[PDB]
Amino acid sequence: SFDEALQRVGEFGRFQRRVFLLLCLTGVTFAFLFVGVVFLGTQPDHYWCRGPSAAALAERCGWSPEEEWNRTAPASRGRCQRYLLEAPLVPCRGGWRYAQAHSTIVSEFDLVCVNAWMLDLTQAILNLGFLTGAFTLGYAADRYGRIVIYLLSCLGVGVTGVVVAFAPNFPVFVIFRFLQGVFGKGTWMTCYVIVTEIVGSKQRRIVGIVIQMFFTLGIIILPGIAYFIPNWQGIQLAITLPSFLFLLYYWVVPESPRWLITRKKGDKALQILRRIAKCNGDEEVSNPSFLDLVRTPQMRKCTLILMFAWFTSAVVYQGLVMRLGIIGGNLYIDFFISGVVELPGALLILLTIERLGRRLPFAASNIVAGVACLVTAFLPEGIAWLRTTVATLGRLGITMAFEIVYLVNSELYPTTLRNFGVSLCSGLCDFGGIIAPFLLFRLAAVWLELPLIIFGILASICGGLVMLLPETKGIALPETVDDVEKL
Numbered sequence: 001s002f003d004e005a006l007q008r009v010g011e012f013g014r015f016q017r018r019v020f021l022l023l024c025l026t027g028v029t030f031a032f033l034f035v036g037v038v039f040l041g042t043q044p045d046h047y048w049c050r051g052p053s054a055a056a057l058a059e060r061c062g063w064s065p066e067e068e069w070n071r072t073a074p075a076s077r078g079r080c081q082r083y084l085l086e087a088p089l090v091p092c093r094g095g096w097r098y099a100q101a102h103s104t105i106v107s108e109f110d111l112v113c114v115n116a117w118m119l120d121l122t123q124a125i126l127n128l129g130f131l132t133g134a135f136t137l138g139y140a141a142d143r144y145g146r147i148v149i150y151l152l153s154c155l156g157v158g159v160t161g162v163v164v165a166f167a168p169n170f171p172v173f174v175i176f177r178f179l180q181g182v183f184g185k186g187t188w189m190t191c192y193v194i195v196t197e198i199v200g201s202k203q204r205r206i207v208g209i210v211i212q213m214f215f216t217l218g219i220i221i222l223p224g225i226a227y228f229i230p231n232w233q234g235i236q237l238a239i240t241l242p243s244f245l246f247l248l249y250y251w252v253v254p255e256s257p258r259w260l261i262t263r264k265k266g267d268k269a270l271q272i273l274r275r276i277a278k279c280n281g282d283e284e285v286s287n288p289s290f291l292d293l294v295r296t297p298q299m300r301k302c303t304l305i306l307m308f309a310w311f312t313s314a315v316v317y318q319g320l321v322m323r324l325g326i327i328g329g330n331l332y333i334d335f336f337i338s339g340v341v342e343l344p345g346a347l348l349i350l351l352t353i354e355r356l357g358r359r360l361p362f363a364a365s366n367i368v369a370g371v372a373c374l375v376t377a378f379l380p381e382g383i384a385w386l387r388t389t390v391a392t393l394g395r396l397g398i399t400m401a402f403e404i405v406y407l408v409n410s411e412l413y414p415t416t417l418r419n420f421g422v423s424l425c426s427g428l429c430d431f432g433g434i435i436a437p438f439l440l441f442r443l444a445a446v447w448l449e450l451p452l453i454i455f456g457i458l459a460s461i462c463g464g465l466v467m468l469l470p471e472t473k474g475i476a477l478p479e480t481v482d483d484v485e486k487l
């Protein structure tokens with residue numbers, strides 16, 4: 001019955017186009033949130049401990065900070081040792097000074113030497129927050145209305161961003177960044193699911209891949225907003241500012257029709273369909289359960305393969321990032337070039353899905369990335385100019401795999417009884433992101449260029465496995481427990 005309703009009103013409309021723009025703006029905001037952390041708090045040029053006698057001397061003679069470095073520098077980067085006039089001398093753990101004028105997270109929180117480890121621990125905590133946020137917000141968003149959970153998640157993102165902009169100390173900052181990652185994950189999941197649902201099953205690939213376009217576009221935009229405003233709090237406030245305007249949507253963006261019409265209310269769905277028409281014209285799901293998500297062989301196998309694919313994609317991308325290094329000799333130029341280069345791969349995704357399907361591009365991209373990383377592992381010493389070129393095609397392949405697998409993940413799961421297994425799989429990807437550095441170091445300890453080989457076989461076997469997905473095209477979206485009957 002819903003199909004016919006889509007035929008009478010649906011597909012592409014003026015209001016639907018406006019809502020699509022709104023939700024892809026939500027996606028680009030999530031892109032800023034996810035990625036801006038790498039830019040926040042870059043390592044300063046020079047940091048060092050200064051003594052109380054040294055501080056008095058410097059303030060009396062008026063040394064410039066740069067000359068203070070040039071004269072006071074020990075050893076012969078940032079030295080972890082200081083001169084103690086009160087000779088070779090012991091390390092210092094207080095009174096640090098940073099020469100770089102640009103404000104950074106490490107300057108404020110004093111993450112240097114051994115303390116430099118919690119700089120990466122902040123990324124670890126944010127990624128764990130993404131994990132737990134997917135894990136909880138799946139159930140939270142399926143329990144209540146999708147749009148309601150989206151709005152509360154946007155409010156949470158805004159409030160948490162504001163509070164972390166003015167966080168006084170490191171522990172409160174870390175816990176609030178955790179509580180901000182949870183809400184950002186909620187926003188991204190709800191927004192993508194609702195924008196995918198509101199569109200009919202003809203240009204659904206277009207809507208998904210174009211909101212991915214907007215995520216990449218946000219990655220592209222990030223260097224500009226990062227470079228124009230120096231102050232760290234400035235970047236954080238700028239990143240979290242759109243969340244409030246997005247809270248402001250409210251009545252403009254309606255609830256997704258299909259989720260509403262599950263025998264629960266019915267009349268409200270008819271009213272909202274009449275509203276969107278304008279002049280152009282079972283047991284209640286209750287709450288999801290993990291056993292039901294794992295129940296039945298087809299559902300179990302699809303879920304496990306999807307989690308494996310997410311994990312492999314995350315770990316291979318993390319492994320390849322270190323080998324990519326710096327391109328062009330400047331961070332801004334490198335980041336901008338990578339962001340721009342992302343786009344042609346995504347347009348290729350669009351056209352190749354349009355011609356035949358999704359599973360073949362998925363497998364091809366995964367195999368391409370695996371072969372690229374394996375070749376980088378086995379390359380003979382030399383080709384320094386060509387060192388950059390390799391492992392870049394692999395990165396494009398991994399990003400393509402991310403986009404295709406995320407769209408397929410949205411497509412496969414039954415919307416009415418969705419536990420946000422999309423969110424749970426993304427959380428398993430997040431878990432892979434957390435453990436990736438430790439596993440990478442452990443593998444690299446025994447022999448160098450070993451982790452690249454391991455990830456090459458992992459990506460190859462993932463590309464072999466992903467062929468097993470059904471990948472039915474034009475079947476619209478499964479309802480309730482009908483997911484089994486596509487096969």
Ligand SMILES: CC[n+]1c(Cc2ccc3ccccc3[n+]2CC)ccc2ccccc21
Pocket residue numbers: 034035212215216313314315317318321398399402403433
């Ligand atoms: C789902 C986030 N997303 C990613 C994920 C990503 C991105 C940058 C990282 C930078 C440093 C470390 C990890 C990193 N990750 C996690 C693998 C990668 C391409 C994407 C392409 C299109 C849309 C989303 C993408």
